[PDB]
Amino acid sequence: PYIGIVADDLTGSGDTAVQFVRAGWATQLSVGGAEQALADPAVRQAEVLAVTTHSRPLAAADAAAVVRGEVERLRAAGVQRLYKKVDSTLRGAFKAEIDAARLAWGEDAIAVVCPAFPVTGRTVRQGVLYVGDRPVTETSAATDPVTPVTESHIPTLLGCAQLAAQAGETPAELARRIAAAAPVVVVDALDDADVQRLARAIGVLGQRAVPVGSGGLAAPLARVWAGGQAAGPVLVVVTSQHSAARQQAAALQQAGARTWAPTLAQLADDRNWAAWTAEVEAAEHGMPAVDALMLLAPEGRLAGLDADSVARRLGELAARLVLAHGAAGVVATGGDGASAVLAALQASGIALVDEVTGGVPLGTLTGGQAAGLPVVTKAGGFGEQDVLIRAAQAIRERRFT
Numbered sequence: 001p002y003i004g005i006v007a008d009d010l011t012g013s014g015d016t017a018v019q020f021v022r023a024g025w026a027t028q029l030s031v032g033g034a035e036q037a038l039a040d041p042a043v044r045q046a047e048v049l050a051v052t053t054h055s056r057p058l059a060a061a062d063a064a065a066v067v068r069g070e071v072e073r074l075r076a077a078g079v080q081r082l083y084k085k086v087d088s089t090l091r092g093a094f095k096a097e098i099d100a101a102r103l104a105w106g107e108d109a110i111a112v113v114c115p116a117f118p119v120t121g122r123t124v125r126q127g128v129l130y131v132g133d134r135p136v137t138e139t140s141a142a143t144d145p146v147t148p149v150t151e152s153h154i155p156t157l158l159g160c161a162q163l164a165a166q167a168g169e170t171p172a173e174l175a176r177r178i179a180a181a182a183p184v185v186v187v188d189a190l191d192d193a194d195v196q197r198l199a200r201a202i203g204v205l206g207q208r209a210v211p212v213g214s215g216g217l218a219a220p221l222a223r224v225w226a227g228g229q230a231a232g233p234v235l236v237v238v239t240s241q242h243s244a245a246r247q248q249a250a251a252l253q254q255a256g257a258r259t260w261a262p263t264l265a266q267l268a269d270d271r272n273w274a275a276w277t278a279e280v281e282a283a284e285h286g287m288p289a290v291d292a293l294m295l296l297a298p299e300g301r302l303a304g305l306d307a308d309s310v311a312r313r314l315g316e317l318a319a320r321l322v323l324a325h326g327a328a329g330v331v332a333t334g335g336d337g338a339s340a341v342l343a344a345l346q347a348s349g350i351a352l353v354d355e356v357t358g359g360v361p362l363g364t365l366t367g368g369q370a371a372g373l374p375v376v377t378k379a380g381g382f383g384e385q386d387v388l389i390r391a392a393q394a395i396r397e398r399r400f401t
Contacts (some may be wrong), residue, residue: 071101249296
């Protein structure tokens with residue numbers, strides 16, 4: 001395994017494990033500990049191994065003992081990223097397990113603690129686990145029949161430090177504050193936005209980080225740790241004249257896509273186009289790496305230049321950039337644009353994996369010269385304004401194997 005998930009109960013391990021699957025990680029679940037699964041010859045197949053320590057009701061020391069043994073076994077087996085999955089509402093021998101997982105993971109391990117789960121009403125604000133508007137201790141969790149919660153201020157509960165993201169901060173900036181708060185630190189999160197930030201920061205901290213969280217942090221970390229794979233840029237081709245498409249294009253380019261957008265006269269004959277394309281190719285060869293690269297057909301009509309030729313010209317240029325430089329994936333809109341890109345790459349179809357949203361499928365190319373390249377296709381007029389951003393992003397945040 002590359003990733004190990006150590007949950008304190010069965011529901012938790014299963015829930016978190018499946019979030020890793022939906023992001024494309026080949027995932028194995030043990031209904032107990034890791035030894036039996038790690039014995040089986042087909043463990044090499046599993047990129048993620050999810051286990052439960054059955055420890056939520058245990059006394060501190062018993063809990064720490066099991067957690068220690070499982071992290072030790074995951075560690076010995078070559079695991080490189082560890083997620084400790086806990087209750088969003090803190091139930092369990094919360095402190096003891098955290099200390100045991102920390103120490104077992106390594107000498108410079110950081111426990112980065114944030115059990116928030118915004119979509120279910122749990123947040124961390126100034127260290128405090130809030131359910132809706134109340135500290136967890138004012139909720140039913142205080143009278144859990146098995147494991148009462150008796151402290152809502154996680155920094156008090158752990159005897160550690162606390163951080164709230166300064167400013168409209170960067171993942172890079174947060175990571176650095178987190179690192180200085182080693183070995184244990186609570187990080188606030190108020191909405192899914194703060195949670196995505198924190199995941200990204202954890203991503204930057206790399207092997208040393210031990211995220212301790214609930215379902216909230218799972219999917220975000222699965223995507224971050226999938227972001228690790230990269231093959232160069234996502235090429236986005238936009239041939240459509242539909243207003244929705246033009247706005248979606250504007251939105252992507254504003255987000256930072258490097259954009260080549262030829263005039264009508266430039267697409268008009270082979271002579272202008274050959275010269276114009278050689279410059280695109282030569283420049284992109286030498287320019288800095290960018291996450292998204294867009295090719296954009298111009299608005300309007302020029303006599304004797306038909307829509308299909310525009311599409312072909314742009315698809316052939318896409319195919320040239322994919323083949324000569326490499327790419328993480330291709331996004332194409334509208335239909336004629338998608339057709340032209342598949343044609344120029346000699347692909348026969350798309351092997352579907354999932355979608356960005358209904359009607360915006362995500363798969364990989366079948367046949368031809370870039371078989372296996374992740375691909376997203378979309379009708380020209382379909383989708384909300386942000387869909388091309390979301391499409392490029394969806395390719396980067398999925399594990400493909």
